[PDB]
Amino acid sequence: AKKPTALIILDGFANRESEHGNAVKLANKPNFDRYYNKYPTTQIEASGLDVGLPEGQMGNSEVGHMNIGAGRIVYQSLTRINKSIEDGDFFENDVLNNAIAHVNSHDSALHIFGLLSDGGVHSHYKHLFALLELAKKQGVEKVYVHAFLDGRDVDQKSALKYIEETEAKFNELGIGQFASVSGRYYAMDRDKRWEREEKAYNAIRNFDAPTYATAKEGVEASYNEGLTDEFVVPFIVENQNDGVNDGDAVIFYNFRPDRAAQLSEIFANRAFEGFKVEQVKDLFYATFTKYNDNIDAAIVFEKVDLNNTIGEIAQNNNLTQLRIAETEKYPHVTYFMSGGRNEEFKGERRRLIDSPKVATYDLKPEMSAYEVKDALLEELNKGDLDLIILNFANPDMVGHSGMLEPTIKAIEAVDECLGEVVDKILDMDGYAIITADHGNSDQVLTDDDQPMTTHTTNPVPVIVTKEGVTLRETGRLGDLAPTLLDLLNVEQPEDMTGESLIKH
Ligand SMILES: [Mn+2]
Ligand SMILES: [Mn+2]
């Protein structure tokens, strides 16, 4: 048998001082406790800037497993764009400046499309303000803003505030105006409901829609009819919309593809047939990210491939590896772990265990953890594995139910499985790193005893089952893969910028 090293991710399992609604602390976890008391231990950050998110933003599974596999901080779109604005590269961006040069050279118009909120899931409105400043700096004359209203990633009736602050911006810079206003239900549909999109399109293009003298006025009218932000029926702002015409440019500042793709196909997929259109000629169509492959767009922030993730380094040292998890975390231990790559590395094998088919996992807190554990045992008994990446989904997936007793039971089943897994590894003269990708199950009740159903910003435990070493006192997810390479005695390449948790 080879000596195995395994990373064991207890999804959504973190350190929190309060015991109130804390399923991690209330659960009986004798194996975890035994390993924790015997072996070297620390705590590392899995939220915010430490994993490429905004300060204060709770971690998640996708961002977590990306950072873990990469062994470095993997900047997500919002932070990437924020930082680009802060250090100036944004204002030098080739694609944004070409879009502007198209407008300036045709004396045509610049249109800006996006979700006008600080939700941060699909867009951030401060990126609109940076586009306004760029256009102003480059002397563009006509800027039309097409506002898509949120109400879903922020309070359900908050649009007036973003609109007001945006109006003050147009006045402060002497450029820009709202030309159309649409609920995200219409402009940001993702279920091929082309009829809803056509209403937004018609307002954007000055074709057919209600008109109001101001963005505020249309929104208040909507509110008066009982229709909140998300559902505002698209409208045109009187005298502030001259259509989308040949030679214009569009910049769409949303960075999340799923809900920006459809509207972008309407304008810039020559094959679009959701409804009949006469597409604009000589249109320069820029998207902040690439929404899909059927849109002829210039892409402002291109995807970066990640070289030398843990799986690639393993391959390149002629090691063999296993990725294993039940369904709900299978993409995390595969695609996201490998840096957003579906293809297996040479020497990679995978094990998918079917999750149960229930609407919510409080109905079976053990989920398929026991079958995951049994698969791993069968794999370890083959003796041919160098590296194992395992995820127990339960604490996250049960914790999302906001129910304390089932989340405790989820943890307890995971603890029983952890015991058999980790003892086998130790039986085989191997090493485990036991940790998590962000918190959740550490808090499943608000302070007033209501269900709490979300991840947390709490730091995560690390146990490394190697005797006579000391761990560094803090760190981040991007340090786990360097710790694995340390355990395996494999050289760490320069593009993995994290650092081994084991002191030397
Ligand atoms: Mn997770
Ligand atoms: Mn989750």
Side-chain angles (χ1 to χ4, degrees), residues 1-141 143-269 271-277 279-504:
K2 292 168 153 149
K3 297 183 225 295
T5 133
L7 183 68
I8 300 180
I9 301 163
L10 313 179
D11 207 292
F13 181 108
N15 298 342
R16 169 153 94 123
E17 190 168 54
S18 180
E19 303 146 27
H20 170 95
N22 181 339
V24 170
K25 282 189 177 170
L26 296 169
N28 284 137
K29 50 193 207 297
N31 301 127
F32 184 95
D33 288 348
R34 163 164 66 92
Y35 297 137
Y36 194 96
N37 296 337
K38 174 162 178 76
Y39 289 108
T41 250
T42 187
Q43 159 181 111
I44 59 174
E45 298 302 322
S47 301
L49 295 168
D50 285 292
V51 301
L53 293 166
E55 264 192 279
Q57 204 152 115
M58 72 192 211
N60 68 65
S61 289
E62 297 66 31
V63 166
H65 282 72
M66 287 262 280
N67 275 260
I68 292 173
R72 71 208 76 172
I73 296 173
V74 184
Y75 289 99
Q76 304 303 119
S77 294
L78 173 47
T79 315
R80 176 179 179 186
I81 292 158
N82 288 343
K83 279 179 184 325
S84 177
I85 292 158
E86 278 317 287
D87 49 43
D89 329 286
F90 177 98
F91 298 99
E92 253 63 80
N93 183 105
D94 269 12
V95 164
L96 295 182
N97 284 301
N98 295 349
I100 290 174
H102 189 252
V103 175
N104 279 340
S105 79
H106 300 232
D107 206 338
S108 57
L110 184 63
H111 300 266
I112 302 167
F113 292 2
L115 188 69
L116 194 78
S117 70
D118 54 1
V121 185
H122 288 267
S123 71
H124 196 124
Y125 81 124
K126 292 293 172 60
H127 301 352
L128 166 68
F129 294 1
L131 293 168
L132 293 170
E133 294 161 356
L134 180 51
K136 146 119 289 195
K137 196 220 197 170
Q138 292 296 73
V140 359
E141 288 179 59
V143 188
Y144 300 90
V145 178
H146 298 278
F148 313 151
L149 298 187
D150 191 353
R152 183 193 274 233
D153 309 310
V154 293
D155 291 350
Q156 80 168 28
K157 297 171 48 153
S158 54
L160 295 180
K161 166 179 159 193
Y162 302 104
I163 287 168
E164 179 177 42
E165 193 189 345
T166 303
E167 295 283 14
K169 205 75 197 180
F170 296 143
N171 294 336
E172 177 188 336
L173 305 166
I175 191 170
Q177 52 204 236
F178 284 126
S180 73
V181 180
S182 306
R184 66 126 95 193
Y185 183 81
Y186 294 96
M188 281 172 65
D189 177 75
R190 68 187 179 205
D191 294 302
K192 298 160 134 46
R193 280 287 109 246
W194 295 116
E195 67 284 4
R196 302 179 185 168
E197 298 275 346
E198 190 168 11
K199 286 197 159 90
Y201 179 72
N202 282 347
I204 292 165
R205 283 258 251 172
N206 204 209
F207 288 168
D208 181 22
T211 127
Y212 284 100
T214 68
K216 174 169 177 319
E217 179 185 35
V219 177
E220 296 270 28
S222 193
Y223 284 181
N224 256 70
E225 300 162 26
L227 290 169
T228 64
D229 299 0
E230 164 166 15
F231 309 105
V232 172
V233 175
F235 72 85
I236 293 139
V237 179
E238 181 171 38
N239 297 312
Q240 288 184 14
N241 192 329
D242 304 299
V244 193
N245 295 293
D246 294 338
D248 285 355
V250 171
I251 305 169
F252 204 160
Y253 60 93
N254 281 34
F255 48 80
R256 175 159 153 174
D258 58 347
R259 286 196 184 282
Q262 283 184 4
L263 183 64
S264 295
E265 297 198 28
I266 285 164
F267 274 100
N269 186 186
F272 177 67
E273 281 282 342
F275 50 87
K276 298 288 171 182
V277 291
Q279 300 194 319
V280 172
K281 293 185 126 89
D282 216 70
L283 179 65
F284 188 107
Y285 195 87
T287 65
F288 258 33
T289 66
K290 193 200 250 226
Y291 304 148
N292 69 27
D293 255 287
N294 298 340
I295 293 153
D296 185 5
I299 304 313
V300 183
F301 294 94
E302 275 177 293
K303 205 206 334 194
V304 301
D305 293 343
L306 289 166
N307 174 243
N308 278 344
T309 63
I310 177 68
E312 195 162 24
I313 296 167
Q315 165 189 93
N316 292 345
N317 291 255
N318 296 132
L319 275 16
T320 64
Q321 60 187 287
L322 173 68
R323 321 294 191 80
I324 176 175
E326 64 177 84
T327 315
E328 287 299 325
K329 305 288 184 189
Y330 186 78
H332 306 79
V333 101
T334 61
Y335 180 76
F336 291 104
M337 189 62 51
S338 287
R341 152 165 171 155
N342 288 127
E343 291 79 11
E344 291 186 314
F345 293 100
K346 307 184 254 100
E348 186 176 342
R349 91 181 83 126
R350 286 179 183 185
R351 281 299 287 282
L352 167 64
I353 309 303
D354 291 335
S355 285
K357 297 291 170 46
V358 285
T360 68
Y361 297 105
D362 55 299
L363 307 188
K364 194 183 179 182
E366 75 274 28
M367 303 182 64
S368 304
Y370 291 104
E371 297 86 339
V372 170
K373 179 266 297 183
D374 286 333
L376 184 46
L377 295 185
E378 171 180 54
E379 300 295 338
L380 290 163
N381 279 312
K382 296 175 187 168
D384 64 334
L385 290 171
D386 301 294
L387 204 210
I388 290 118
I389 293 169
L390 192 220
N391 179 305
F392 286 119
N394 315 50
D396 195 53
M397 299 309 304
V398 187
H400 282 295
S401 83
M403 295 172 135
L404 179 63
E405 302 301 312
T407 302
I408 290 166
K409 295 295 156 145
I411 291 169
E412 298 181 342
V414 169
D415 191 77
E416 188 174 12
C417 296
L418 183 66
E420 299 182 36
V421 166
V422 172
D423 291 345
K424 219 259 149 47
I425 282 159
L426 290 165
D427 245 283
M428 297 178 65
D429 312 307
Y431 301 124
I433 296 170
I434 298 164
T435 189
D437 65 328
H438 55 84
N440 179 332
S441 56
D442 40 298
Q443 183 177 4
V444 305
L445 301 184
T446 69
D447 291 359
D448 297 334
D449 287 324
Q450 218 49 35
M452 210 296 291
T453 64
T454 68
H455 296 167
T456 68
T457 59
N458 294 138
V460 297
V462 180
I463 312 169
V464 177
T465 67
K466 176 151 212 289
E467 308 184 23
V469 300
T470 313
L471 310 189
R472 293 192 297 106
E473 350 267 283
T474 192
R476 63 193 42 107
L477 297 179
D479 296 332
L480 269 342
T483 314
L484 295 169
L485 269 10
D486 192 351
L487 258 14
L488 295 160
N489 285 319
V490 169
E491 188 190 342
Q492 186 181 323
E494 305 226 83
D495 44 355
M496 194 174 267
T497 47
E499 170 185 4
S500 179
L501 299 170
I502 300 162
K503 295 202 199 164
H504 286 279

